[PDB]
Design a protein around this ligand. Sequence first.
Ligand code: NA
Ligand code: NA
Lengths: 125, 125
Amino acid sequence: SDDALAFLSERHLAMLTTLRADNSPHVVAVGFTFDPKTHIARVITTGGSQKAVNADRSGLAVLSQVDGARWLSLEGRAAVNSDIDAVRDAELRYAQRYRTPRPNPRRVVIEVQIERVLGSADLLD
Amino acid sequence: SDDALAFLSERHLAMLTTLRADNSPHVVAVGFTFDPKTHIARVITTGGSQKAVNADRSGLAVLSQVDGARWLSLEGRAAVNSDIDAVRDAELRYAQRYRTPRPNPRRVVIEVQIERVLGSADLLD
Ligand code: NA
Ligand code: NA
């Protein structure tokens, strides 16, 4: 829905859930971006972070955002992309929502192909 | 830390992460309470909810709260308690942070024994 898309444009952090090797959830705050056309969500991080290692190793992620009583969780399949062009593009998408990220040659992108969306009733449909 | 305890008293929702049978994370917004003395976090829900089924079946949960740049994730071992006295007590703890919950004879409590805390640097130590 359009209210959902506006919510996803607001400047807030979200929680990224990935799985550790033992299947325990690792849940940490991140910024993210969401492309409504492709359904790809992106998190930028430094290579080798626990987020990146978990996303690469287990292949899934959830991004969960809440403000007041409004919330969404976006679930999907995750991979890590270290291609320089992909990283630049993700940095610019990030800047579009947040602000210009600090330069970091070690930056990688966690790309999540969203399959399922849960959320508050005011944001679904 | 004391700033962490104050953060955990503020009236905000949080995300509860549990695992589905297939190990995919189920992440939905909840209110919760946290007892600093016992390290028990509590979520009230209607019996048979996906949260309750996942907590009972897989035995783990994470509660994650974010406001602005401040955040905490509380990880631990989860169980479902349907004892009437436990439910009343959890309802009152909930009311202490939020407001009196609607009467519901089917209410159960997800009790999470917190083992690990992650968060923003301003809240740890
Ligand atoms: Na960091
Ligand atoms: Na509900």
